[PDB]
Structure formats: C-alpha cells, structure tokens
Amino acid sequence: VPITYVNRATXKCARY
Amino acid sequence: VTGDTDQPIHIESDQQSLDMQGNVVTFTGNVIVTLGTIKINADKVVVTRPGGEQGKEVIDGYGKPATFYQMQDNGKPVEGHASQMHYELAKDFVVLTGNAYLQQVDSNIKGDKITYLV
Numbered sequence: 001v002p003i004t005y006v007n008r009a010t011x012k013c014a015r016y
Numbered sequence: 017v018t019g020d021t022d023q024p025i026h027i028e029s030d031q032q033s034l035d036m037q038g039n040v041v042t043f044t045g046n047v048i049v050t051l052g053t054i055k056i057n058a059d060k061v062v063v064t065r066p067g068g069e070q071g072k073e074v075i076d077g078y079g080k081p082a083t084f085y086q087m088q089d090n091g092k093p094v095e096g097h098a099s100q101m102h103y104e105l106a107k108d109f110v111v112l113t114g115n116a117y118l119q120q121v122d123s124n125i126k127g128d129k130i131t132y133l134v
Contacts, residue, residue: 005028
C-alpha cells in the first residue's frame with residue numbers, strides 16, 4: 001500500500 | 017463495517033508541503049519513525065524512490081539534530097546524534113554523517129561518518 005500518516009493539524013489521518 | 021486497512025509503520029507530521037510542480041514532499045515539525053525496537057526523530061524529512069521495479073524507497077532527516085533512541089530488555093537503552101542521518105530502506109541500513117556520536121552498551125564512538133543497525 002502507499003505511505004499513510006496522521007497530522008497534528010487535521011486530527012484525521014491520510015495516505016500520501 | 018469499514019475503518020483502517022493496514023499500518024506497517026506509524027508516521028506523524030505537524031506540517032506537510034507537497035511539490036505541485038513535480039512530486040517531492042517536504043516534511044516539517046516532529047516527524048517520528050517507528051521500526052522494531054528503534055526510533056528516529058527529525059523536523060526535516062524528505063521522501064525519494066530512485067528505482068521503480070525494485071520499489072526502492074529512501075528517506076533522510078536532520079536539523080533537530082536527528083537522534084536515535086533504543087529501549088533494551090536487559091536495562092541498557094542506547095542513543096546517538098548526527099548533523100545528517102539517512103534511511104536507505106532499499107538497502108536495509110542506516111548511516112550518520114557530520115559529528116556522528118553513538119553510544120553502544122560497551123562504550124561510545126564520535127567521528128565523521130558512522131554506520132548503524134536496524
């Protein structure tokens with residue numbers, strides 16, 4: 001699968 | 017039901033900047049790498065892939081300055097610092113550059129350029 005990460009701004013996470 | 021699908025490495029960011037003229041990603045903030053019984057941290061991380069067929073991921077990171085941290089079952093955790101630190105994932109290996117310090121369980125080492133294990 002592609003890279004995925006969480007963000008200290010959005011709270012919800014995402015793929016690259 | 018629906019939800020997650022896979023998390024083989026956990027990653028977080030404070031601020032991302034994507035190259036809308038090409039493809040590269042600048043990371044900024046407190047980027048974490050989780051891998052087995054080690055971790056790495058930086059502000060700056062960059063993501064590149066110099067070979068499509070063999071799926072050849074590579075990253076690096078510094079400026080914090082970048083450090084290792086290891087938590088050890090025998091009560092002997094270990095760490096180190098560098099001016100530059102790379103993770104050649106497509107080579108199973110890690111390298112430090114510029115004022116590379118590592119402490120082992122036995123002694124320390126401090127020099128130009130130093131190899132590290134997973």
